[PDB]
Amino acid sequence: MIRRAPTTLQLSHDDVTSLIDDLNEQKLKQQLNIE
Amino acid sequence: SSSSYRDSYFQYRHLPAPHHILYAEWNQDILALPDEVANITMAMMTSEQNSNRYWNSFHDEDDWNLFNGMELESNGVVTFAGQETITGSIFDRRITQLAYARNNGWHELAL
Amino acid sequence: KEIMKNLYKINLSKYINTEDITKSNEILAKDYKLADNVDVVRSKVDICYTQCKFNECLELCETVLENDEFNTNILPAYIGCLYELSNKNKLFLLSHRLAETFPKSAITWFSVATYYMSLDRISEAQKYYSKSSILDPSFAAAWLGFAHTYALEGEQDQALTAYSTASRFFPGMHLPKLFLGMQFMAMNSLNLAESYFVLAYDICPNDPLVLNE
Amino acid sequence: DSQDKIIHDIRIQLRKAATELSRWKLYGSSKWAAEALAGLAEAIPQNGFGLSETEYDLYLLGSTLFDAKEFDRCVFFLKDVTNPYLKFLKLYSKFLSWDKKSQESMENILTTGKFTDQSNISSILKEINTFLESYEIKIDDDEADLGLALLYYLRGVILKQEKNISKAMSSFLKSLSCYSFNWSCWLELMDCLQKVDDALLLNNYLYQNFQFKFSENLGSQRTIEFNIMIKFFKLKVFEELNGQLEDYFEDLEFLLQVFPNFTFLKAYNATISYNNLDYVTAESRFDDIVKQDPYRLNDLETYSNILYVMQKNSKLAYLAQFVSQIDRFRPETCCIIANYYSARQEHEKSIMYFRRALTLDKKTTNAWTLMGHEFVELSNSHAAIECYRRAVDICPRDFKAWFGLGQAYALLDMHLYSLYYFQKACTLKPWDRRIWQVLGECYSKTGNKVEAIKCYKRSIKASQTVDQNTSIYYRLAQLYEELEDLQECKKFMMKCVDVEELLEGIVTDETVKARLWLAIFEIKAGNYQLAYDYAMGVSSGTSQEIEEARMLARECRRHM
């Protein structure tokens, strides 16, 4: 009797792309305040 | 600077002959694994059957006969080949004995 | 009374208060002459395998196999520990040695099949798990490995039936229920996976695998 | 009683032997000394050196720059020292600097030697002679330290490499007399020996007019009869040269008692079984070495040599994978794998490892003949001829090389051109059936029937078992048939047939032709009854054999 690797999940594409989009929001709005 | 004063890794003085570094490629040689790769020399799917036959040689005659065409399906229902068929579910001791019976046993319709 | 109590307690199942078993076998080791007997080292091997102390697997198993080369009580744990360590050469020697002596027993063919397993030969090792299962019923190792051969590479549909057979024919073990639930999870079907996981947790309360799942 | 006292003497001495020799950074004997003590039978540190604190500072500089491979730098700082203990270190640093440099200079050069069979080396020799005269002992005195004895070892080895034999031997004896238990010194002494008669000359000298300095050596050890190196000398020189044995048995069992766990003896003990063509027992002997000592790439070349003849490719594949994992730079580790690769009919790769195995250590001339063989299976006779020919040029007394070179011509049609090579191999091992039979075939194929007759008769006597003479008898009878005298060949036809009866009916192929021919001639003799049984006895041969006798049986039965 042998156990395989237990199921583990990493960062998906959807959530990482959402974080990328958010990063663009706070890298887009602040320079308007500077300007 | 300071180069030879550190000794925390494999260095040029740890191996016996400093000139062995000239070759320095024998470390990166994959030695042929024991059994099935011997089949590629003749060739210069077949290797797996060869390894299967080699490991199949360790049977008794009656045991080999039973496993000669043996196929096991996923749900546990078992198919037995008569050299009739004995399709029955596994993990019950009786079916196997029955398979042995009509294998080596004597059956005669006698008109 | 005390020596027989310890002797029986050696063989109890793990996952529950293993410290008590450790203390009992330590008491049995020094006080009495039973210091390095077969069952005490077998219990140590079972303990290390449960806690994945695979190094101790190999030392204790080698130190016991050097006396008895064919002790069937320890061979399953020994094979699992070596498979985890992927000692291909040692496994080939063991498989060959058991092939010349015990062709009938399912342990030999399970060993040969896991030798194929370690070389990534799932499709071929399928047949050899089938042979090991046929030669000896009521053997969790053979059928569970056979289900692993189904589940590892494609053909997902009937791995479900294989694991259901494992659960029904081998009641009382949380492992088949856990495997079936995880496979349903692999299908992205959720409620059934949760149901099988809670079933496995019911069978076994203390197991990192089931709680992680 | 006294044996235990001897046991009590050896560990302390071997503690001393491994101490200074390792302390003086020579590993030829230091590695062996600790090995010997480890295998010794179960029954405060010891150190001493006459060095001043001023000069002892140079020792640490000298010693540490030695193993750091900077031999030349060690010489420069240790130039002005005058102590004999340090004077050895400077010249030893000087000598090994040349030896290491020479190895780098030639790596493409496989063959080593001079075809007819200095000044930089002669520079080293002068400091030894100049320093030896200046120092106020110059051996032959009771108060002779280890360093001066150790100095003579360097003088001997530097003399040998200049091919000044018969002077290094005397120097080696002087060094061993003042200090025994120096294996590297003994090995250089064994090397200069060339023939067995030379060994008897040195052995006598070791017994009557040789004695150790009892002051330096511990008591109960300077006696020649209770020494150990003299014993280890007996086991070494007497068998590698395969010389006539004397005072060898009683010593061998004496060393097995004192050294039951010594790894070197068992491998040597296993090698003795190897040298006598006793393969089955040697395998059991070797199996203890691997189990007891799994990492020893010193005598395993014979182990993988045993396995190749034994067949069992799965085991060889196991050994090849296991040995290669330790390291791939030993001379042996590159010969074991090639054997594994040869069994798999992969020749273009196996041929590679033999050339590799020889390059690491050019002294392993046994790989030359194997590399030649590996060309023959490649259907490349031209390349094989050179590979065999180098082997005899390293040392003309190689029976393996001559035989392997003789066959390569015999495979081709050049039968007579191979006769000289086979003749040369005859002198090496005359007492062999295999070689003599081959010589007979060459004479038979060259129209020398008068000589081939005498050649086969010699082969018959050398054969240990009668059954091996079955094949020769039939061919020998044929040659008489070519020498138009049918009566003479009958007697040999009786013997070859009679061997079948003496072997409870062996019924072999070359006797089948004997009975068919014998029955045919008996028909011409008019004795049908004596011919009838011959056909019946051969009725269990080939398809054509049985029918030939069956029709002959009918012919003789009618006239019976």
Side-chain angles (χ1 to χ4, degrees), chain A, chain B residues 1-83 85-110, chain C, chain D residues 2 6-43 45-56 58-117 119-137 139 144 146-212 214-221 223-444 446-544 546-547 549 551-553 556:
Chain A
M1 66 72 69
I2 58 152
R3 163 70 181 156
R4 64 201 176 275
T7 187
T8 59
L9 183 63
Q10 69 276 17
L11 277 296
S12 69
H13 173 119
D14 291 331
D15 62 358
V16 69
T17 47
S18 76
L19 191 152
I20 297 298
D21 285 331
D22 186 74
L23 294 178
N24 320 127
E25 68 83 8
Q26 71 272 15
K27 196 82 141 163
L28 62 78
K29 65 182 181 293
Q30 80 282 19
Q31 76 259 19
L32 175 59
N33 291 339
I34 293 163
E35 290 174 357
Chain B
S1 68
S2 64
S3 296
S4 293
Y5 296 96
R6 185 183 64 246
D7 81 5
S8 66
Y9 58 90
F10 199 21
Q11 182 50 268
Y12 69 89
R13 38 176 181 111
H14 284 114
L15 72 169
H19 83 81
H20 285 329
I21 189 74
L22 182 153
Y23 314 142
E25 91 280 0
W26 307 89
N27 284 318
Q28 294 82 17
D29 292 22
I30 62 170
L31 277 296
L33 82 173
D35 194 357
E36 70 272 19
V37 75
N39 277 3
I40 200 167
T41 293
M42 71 195 178
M44 321 285 258
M45 290 79 76
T46 316
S47 72
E48 61 88 26
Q49 294 173 355
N50 290 323
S51 67
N52 187 1
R53 68 181 67 187
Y54 177 73
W55 277 113
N56 195 1
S57 176
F58 296 120
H59 291 88
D60 291 331
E61 291 325 316
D62 182 75
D63 173 58
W64 182 88
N65 290 318
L66 178 57
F67 289 165
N68 187 0
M70 186 66 202
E71 185 273 2
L72 178 61
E73 62 86 20
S74 46
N75 87 74
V77 163
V78 184
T79 183
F80 285 160
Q83 53 65 19
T85 301
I86 302 299
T87 67
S89 176
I90 205 170
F91 292 83
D92 80 45
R93 297 75 204 171
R94 281 81 59 193
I95 62 170
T96 61
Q97 194 303 320
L98 182 159
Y100 291 110
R102 62 179 295 275
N103 183 359
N104 61 21
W106 171 52
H107 47 307
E108 171 66 351
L109 73 159
Chain C
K1 181 167 216 154
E2 72 296 340
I3 189 65
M4 305 334 297
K5 181 165 181 308
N6 293 283
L7 203 46
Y8 283 37
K9 186 176 180 180
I10 192 167
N11 283 311
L12 272 71
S13 173
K14 278 70 66 178
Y15 305 93
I16 301 295
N17 72 314
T18 64
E19 198 273 334
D20 212 326
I21 298 100
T22 50
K23 66 174 286 294
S24 279
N25 56 67
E26 306 296 309
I27 288 298
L28 193 141
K30 44 191 210 173
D31 292 31
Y32 319 88
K33 303 308 298 202
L34 311 177
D36 62 358
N37 207 358
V38 161
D39 63 357
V40 65
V41 65
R42 173 166 67 97
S43 174
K44 309 315 150 276
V45 175
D46 291 331
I47 285 285
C48 62
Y49 171 62
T50 51
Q51 298 83 14
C52 296
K53 286 177 188 161
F54 289 109
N55 290 318
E56 313 89 312
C57 284
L58 193 40
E59 69 272 15
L60 288 164
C61 294
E62 66 183 1
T63 53
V64 65
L65 271 293
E66 65 93 9
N67 316 88
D68 193 81
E69 206 272 330
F70 293 104
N71 202 324
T72 63
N73 296 348
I74 62 177
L75 294 174
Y78 187 51
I79 296 297
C81 290
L82 62 77
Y83 171 53
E84 182 63 28
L85 272 296
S86 80
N87 282 121
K88 283 153 193 289
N89 196 16
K90 187 269 183 188
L91 184 63
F92 182 81
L93 276 296
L94 187 153
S95 281
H96 183 71
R97 279 301 179 189
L98 281 71
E100 295 101 3
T101 56
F102 277 10
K104 184 71 141 163
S105 65
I107 300 299
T108 294
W109 295 107
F110 170 58
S111 167
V112 176
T114 191
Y115 181 76
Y116 283 99
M117 168 52 48
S118 63
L119 188 153
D120 189 358
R121 294 214 211 174
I122 324 298
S123 64
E124 194 267 8
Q126 206 175 251
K127 284 172 321 193
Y128 286 163
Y129 288 164
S130 69
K131 272 177 184 64
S132 174
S133 65
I134 297 169
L135 294 174
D136 181 4
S138 85
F139 202 61
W143 189 254
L144 270 295
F146 189 24
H148 294 105
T149 61
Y150 290 166
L152 188 153
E153 57 89 20
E155 183 66 11
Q156 195 276 320
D157 270 4
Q158 54 97 10
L160 296 175
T161 47
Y163 279 119
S164 87
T165 301
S167 81
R168 191 264 291 261
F169 270 19
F170 294 160
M173 187 66 204
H174 76 289
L175 195 53
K177 297 290 212 332
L178 182 49
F179 286 166
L180 200 154
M182 67 76 62
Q183 195 57 219
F184 273 51
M185 185 180 288
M187 293 298 102
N188 284 103
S189 291
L190 278 75
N191 308 282
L192 295 174
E194 78 194 340
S195 184
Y196 279 76
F197 281 4
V198 73
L199 281 146
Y201 174 47
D202 189 358
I203 292 169
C204 184
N206 289 118
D207 188 14
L209 285 71
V210 62
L211 294 174
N212 189 0
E213 297 289 328
Chain D
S2 69
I6 293 171
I7 297 301
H8 156 256
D9 191 17
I10 306 311
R11 74 278 194 182
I12 62 166
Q13 185 65 13
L14 266 293
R15 282 184 205 163
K16 184 182 186 51
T19 305
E20 278 89 4
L21 294 190
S22 74
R23 191 65 65 186
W24 289 123
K25 300 290 191 291
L26 61 84
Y27 318 113
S29 291
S30 164
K31 180 205 168 313
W32 187 49
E35 182 65 26
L37 190 153
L40 190 146
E42 202 279 328
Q46 285 73 17
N47 65 62
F49 272 128
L51 278 300
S52 82
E53 300 303 313
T54 61
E55 76 205 350
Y56 174 80
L58 280 73
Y59 179 75
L60 277 296
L61 182 64
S63 197
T64 316
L65 276 296
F66 182 81
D67 56 0
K69 300 335 288 185
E70 289 329 291
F71 300 84
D72 285 340
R73 196 204 178 129
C74 179
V75 176
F76 170 67
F77 288 78
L78 197 63
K79 64 186 181 293
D80 60 355
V81 65
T82 64
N83 189 295
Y85 286 168
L86 285 203
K87 174 63 73 174
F88 167 83
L89 191 150
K90 179 185 79 171
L91 296 172
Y92 197 89
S93 181
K94 190 180 184 167
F95 172 52
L96 201 153
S97 48
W98 175 78
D99 290 359
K100 168 190 161 272
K101 269 194 187 51
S102 72
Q103 294 291 341
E104 291 150 80
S105 64
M106 63 80 71
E107 69 305 354
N108 303 322
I109 297 299
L110 306 178
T111 184
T112 68
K114 290 187 67 174
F115 168 109
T116 184
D117 187 74
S119 291
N120 300 322
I121 295 300
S122 301
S123 172
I124 282 176
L125 185 59
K126 182 63 68 177
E127 298 68 22
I128 292 169
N129 267 342
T130 296
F131 184 84
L132 203 42
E133 183 51 285
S134 58
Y135 186 72
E136 64 272 16
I137 291 299
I139 207 165
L146 202 172
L148 71 83
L150 183 61
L151 294 172
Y152 266 118
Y153 159 82
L154 188 153
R155 180 175 176 270
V157 70
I158 202 57
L159 263 180
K160 181 67 175 294
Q161 203 84 7
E162 202 263 356
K163 204 152 78 166
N164 195 354
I165 303 93
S166 71
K167 290 187 67 66
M169 57 82 70
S170 88
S171 177
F172 283 153
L173 301 203
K174 307 312 152 283
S175 180
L176 294 174
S177 64
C178 184
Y179 193 42
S180 48
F181 291 164
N182 188 359
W183 187 251
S184 63
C185 188
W186 289 98
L187 271 295
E188 206 61 275
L189 188 152
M190 61 79 71
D191 189 357
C192 70
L193 282 296
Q194 315 192 11
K195 294 162 161 113
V196 54
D197 57 358
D198 296 329
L200 62 85
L201 187 147
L202 61 78
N203 192 5
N204 294 323
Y205 191 99
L206 183 65
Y207 268 129
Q208 285 85 19
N209 49 4
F210 190 66
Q211 74 285 359
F212 298 166
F214 187 77
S215 58
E216 209 292 320
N217 283 259
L218 276 296
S220 175
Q221 182 57 253
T223 61
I224 50 174
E225 192 276 332
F226 280 114
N227 205 4
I228 292 185
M229 298 302 81
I230 302 163
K231 310 293 191 186
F232 272 101
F233 185 74
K234 179 61 59 56
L235 61 89
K236 184 58 62 173
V237 65
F238 264 90
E239 297 307 319
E240 293 180 353
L241 182 43
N242 210 135
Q244 171 181 347
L245 73 165
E246 61 92 20
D247 289 328
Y248 174 73
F249 281 163
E250 68 273 26
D251 291 1
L252 194 152
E253 282 101 10
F254 164 61
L255 276 296
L256 267 296
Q257 157 189 322
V258 61
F259 288 163
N261 303 335
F262 192 30
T263 75
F264 172 79
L265 293 179
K266 303 179 195 26
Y268 167 71
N269 179 287
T271 296
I272 288 294
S273 178
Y274 202 114
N275 199 37
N276 291 4
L277 280 298
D278 293 329
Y279 281 97
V280 166
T281 73
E283 182 274 343
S284 73
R285 306 276 194 78
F286 286 108
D287 283 332
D288 186 74
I289 303 296
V290 164
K291 186 72 44 163
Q292 176 175 355
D293 192 313
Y295 306 115
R296 176 180 182 82
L297 300 169
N298 293 110
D299 293 330
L300 283 187
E301 51 282 17
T302 66
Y303 194 103
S304 64
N305 192 359
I306 289 289
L307 293 194
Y308 184 51
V309 175
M310 185 179 288
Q311 325 295 128
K312 154 195 71 177
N313 291 322
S314 89
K315 179 72 66 65
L316 277 296
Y318 170 63
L319 195 153
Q321 185 61 70
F322 167 60
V323 298
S324 175
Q325 183 66 41
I326 298 89
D327 63 328
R328 307 193 174 90
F329 300 143
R330 294 290 72 75
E332 312 315 346
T333 187
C334 291
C335 69
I336 297 89
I337 55 172
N339 271 353
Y340 155 72
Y341 263 88
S342 177
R344 188 177 277 78
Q345 289 83 21
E346 181 62 25
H347 296 74
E348 293 83 4
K349 183 76 71 68
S350 50
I351 189 63
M352 185 156 157
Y353 282 157
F354 285 165
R355 172 191 258 264
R356 155 64 39 167
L358 60 84
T359 301
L360 282 296
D361 189 358
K362 267 80 72 168
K363 187 65 64 67
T364 304
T365 182
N366 286 319
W368 269 127
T369 76
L370 278 69
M371 179 142 80
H373 286 100
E374 183 66 25
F375 284 108
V376 175
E377 290 293 328
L378 186 58
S379 78
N380 186 357
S381 75
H382 287 264
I385 298 298
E386 281 292 317
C387 187
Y388 292 102
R389 183 71 180 86
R390 283 178 201 280
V392 176
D393 285 331
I394 301 299
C395 185
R397 174 187 320 310
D398 291 331
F399 175 85
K400 185 64 140 163
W402 280 118
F403 186 76
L405 188 42
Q407 291 261 356
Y409 281 158
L411 271 297
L412 297 171
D413 291 331
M414 288 73 72
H415 285 80
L416 183 62
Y417 189 40
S418 72
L419 183 63
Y420 163 73
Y421 293 0
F422 285 131
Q423 287 176 358
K424 191 69 68 173
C426 179
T427 71
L428 275 297
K429 179 182 201 310
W431 31 267
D432 202 304
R433 173 202 81 260
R434 192 62 159 289
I435 178 162
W436 276 121
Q437 177 169 357
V438 166
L439 183 63
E441 190 277 331
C442 181
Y443 277 122
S444 67
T446 56
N448 196 339
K449 300 289 94 179
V450 65
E451 168 73 10
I453 299 305
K454 289 179 301 190
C455 182
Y456 280 167
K457 276 73 176 175
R458 160 69 51 96
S459 81
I460 290 297
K461 285 161 36 59
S463 54
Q464 69 275 17
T465 47
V466 181
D467 303 357
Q468 299 171 36
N469 304 137
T470 304
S471 297
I472 298 85
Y473 283 162
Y474 171 62
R475 275 70 174 174
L476 193 50
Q478 279 183 172
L479 295 186
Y480 281 167
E481 195 277 332
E482 287 295 341
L483 204 45
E484 286 79 42
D485 55 355
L486 277 298
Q487 290 331 306
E488 191 69 31
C489 80
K490 280 187 71 171
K491 277 74 69 177
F492 283 132
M493 293 300 291
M494 298 298 102
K495 298 186 176 71
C496 68
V497 160
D498 274 22
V499 171
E500 187 155 288
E501 183 178 1
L502 289 186
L503 265 295
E504 62 211 68
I506 194 72
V507 194
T508 175
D509 272 298
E510 61 285 350
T511 53
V512 165
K513 297 176 178 64
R515 313 282 183 113
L516 294 174
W517 185 98
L518 204 49
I520 279 291
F521 177 80
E522 276 293 340
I523 303 309
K524 304 314 153 275
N527 195 340
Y528 298 82
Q529 184 264 332
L530 172 44
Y532 165 68
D533 56 350
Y534 280 158
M536 182 179 72
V538 72
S539 53
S540 59
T542 69
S543 299
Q544 295 322 98
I546 56 170
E547 55 88 18
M551 56 77 69
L552 188 153
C556 65

